[PDB]
Amino acid sequence: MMIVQRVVLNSRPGKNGNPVAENFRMEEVYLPDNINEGQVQVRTLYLSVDPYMRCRMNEDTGTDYITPWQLSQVVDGGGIGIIEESKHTNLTKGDFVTSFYWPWQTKVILDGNSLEKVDPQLVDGHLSYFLGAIGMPGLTSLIGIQEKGHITAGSNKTMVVSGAAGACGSVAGQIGHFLGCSRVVGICGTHEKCILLTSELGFDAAINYKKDNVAEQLRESCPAGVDVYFDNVGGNISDTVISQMNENSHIILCGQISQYNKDVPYPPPLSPAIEAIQKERNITRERFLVLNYKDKFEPGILQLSQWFKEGKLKIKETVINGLENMGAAFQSMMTGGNIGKQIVCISEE
Ligand SMILES: NC(=O)c1ccc[n+]([C@@H]2O[C@H](COP(=O)([O-])OP(=O)(O)OC[C@H]3O[C@@H](n4cnc5c(N)ncnc54)[C@H](OP(=O)(O)O)[C@@H]3O)[C@@H](O)[C@H]2O)c1
Numbered sequence: 001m002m003i004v005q006r007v008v009l010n011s012r013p014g015k016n017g018n019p020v021a022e023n024f025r026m027e028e029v030y031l032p033d034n035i036n037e038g039q040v041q042v043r044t045l046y047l048s049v050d051p052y053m054r055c056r057m058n059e060d061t062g063t064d065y066i067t068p069w070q071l072s073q074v075v076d077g078g079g080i081g082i083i084e085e086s087k088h089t090n091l092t093k094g095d096f097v098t099s100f101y102w103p104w105q106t107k108v109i110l111d112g113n114s115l116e117k118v119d120p121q122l123v124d125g126h127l128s129y130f131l132g133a134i135g136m137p138g139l140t141s142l143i144g145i146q147e148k149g150h151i152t153a154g155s156n157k158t159m160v161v162s163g164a165a166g167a168c169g170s171v172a173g174q175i176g177h178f179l180g181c182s183r184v185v186g187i188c189g190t191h192e193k194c195i196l197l198t199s200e201l202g203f204d205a206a207i208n209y210k211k212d213n214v215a216e217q218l219r220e221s222c223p224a225g226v227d228v229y230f231d232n233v234g235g236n237i238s239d240t241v242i243s244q245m246n247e248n249s250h251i252i253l254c255g256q257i258s259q260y261n262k263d264v265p266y267p268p269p270l271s272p273a274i275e276a277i278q279k280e281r282n283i284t285r286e287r288f289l290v291l292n293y294k295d296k297f298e299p300g301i302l303q304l305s306q307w308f309k310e311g312k313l314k315i316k317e318t319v320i321n322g323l324e325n326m327g328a329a330f331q332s333m334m335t336g337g338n339i340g341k342q343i344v345c346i347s348e349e
């Protein structure tokens with residue numbers, strides 16, 4: 001047996017705690033030399049870290065959609081790899097495959113049925129895009145806008161995006177323009193990200209919530225109010241945005257990342273004053289869970305791919321190398337170190 005590396009849950013930060021690199025631990029383990037019928041041996045190429053993983057660090061995730069990781073057991077999440085050996089009828093050495101529950105380990109023996117083969121032509125050979133813009137975050141943005149945004153044919157709406165330089169947000173803002181908004185404004189956490197948005201991703205304006213006057217800048221950059229809010233963050237930021245939203249406007253309630261490490265359920269309740277405004281102005285604020293639109297994954301991926309290949313959709317990512325950096329990458333992402341999709345490259349081939 002050859003020795004490979006893997007990552008296990010070392011400790012929990014507590015439901016009110018901050019995640020740190022050291023909640024995870026690297027181990028060296030043997031990889032079995034033989035696989036069974038129906039199984040494949042895969043080499044891991046890229047792994048995703050994503051905010052929802054914070055929940056799997058707790059004893060109770062707070063939702064049936066994801067289960068808690070267990071102390072000292074291998075952790076898992078979105079991944080992409082290449083088949084090294086197959087005893088599954090529909091997979092063959094050299095196929096590129098993805099799983100939602102890829103164990104954080106350099107080489108893995110997996111049930112062939114748990115994997116999906118992917119076509120690298122969809123991403124011009126940039127396989128890591130399958131974990132981001134031409135993956136679940138991209139679908140979340142495209143489907144969320146389609147289903148919850150109500151961007152009418154021929155209209156000239158203003159869209160605001162929170163978490164605007166992250167995975168979902170950076171795509172959402174571009175899609176807002178693609179699909180007919182005349183104004184797209186992003187809110188994000190650094191001046192570097194503001195520049196990215198307006199100089200590369202085509203946002204009409206960007207606001208740094210840590211340093212700028214958010215209400216003031218939204219009044220300046222959204223002179224006709226806000227019709228569509230793609231909300232990744234919640235909290236104080238969303239209160240400020242909602243206060244400037246128009247009658248019959250729409251909140252795409254993607255995530256509420258500002259309410260993490262507090263024991264706060266989703267959808268989190270708007271404060272009394274902000275709920276009053278929401279209701280007065282008939283602002284819609286429904287649950288949105290991308291998995292409820294599985295039937296749109298095919299056209300969604302096909303559209304994301306097309307826009308990318310056309311040079312319209314600009315795909316940003318921040319890649320860190322080495323499985324030993326999974327914990328660091330997750331912590332970094334949670335605290336805003338990522339521009340676009342946070343990726344960890346496990347083998348650079
Ligand atoms: N509804 C769905 O089906 C669905 C699907 C996928 C993801 N999501 C959710 O959508 C959200 C975005 O996920 P993502 O994958 O696109 O992550 P991401 O935006 O790429 O990364 C998270 C970012 O959140 C920002 N942030 C962190 N703490 C914050 C705070 N307290 N206040 C404001 N901003 C903060 C940081 O950027 P700054 O530098 O700008 O602070 C960080 O880079 C998360 O809530 C995620 O769980 C929902």
Ligand SMILES: CC1(C)[C@@H](O)CC[C@]2(C)[C@H]3C(=O)C=C4[C@@H]5C[C@@](C)(C(=O)O)CC[C@]5(C)CC[C@@]4(C)[C@]3(C)CC[C@@H]12
Pocket residue numbers: 098116117118119130131134135136139297298301302
């Ligand atoms: C996991 C995510 C979100 C992504 O991270 C990687 C790509 C992918 C795994 C993706 C894929 O790779 C191939 C197909 C196929 C494309 C197509 C056109 C075909 O090739 O027949 C039609 C059938 C089929 C199954 C539709 C569904 C998708 C788009 C499928 C599985 C949706 C889920 C998707």
Ligand SMILES: CC1(C)[C@@H](O)CC[C@]2(C)[C@H]3C(=O)C=C4[C@@H]5C[C@@](C)(C(=O)O)CC[C@]5(C)CC[C@@]4(C)[C@]3(C)CC[C@@H]12
Pocket residue numbers: 050051052055063065066100136254255256257266288289290291
């Ligand atoms: C496909 C699976 C099963 C998983 O394989 C990948 C992540 C994910 C796509 C996952 C996600 O990515 C982000 C969230 C959010 C996390 C959280 C805490 C927030 O961020 O506000 C609360 C709101 C919200 C939408 C709850 C639902 C989940 C857990 C959501 C969509 C459930 C479905 C889930």
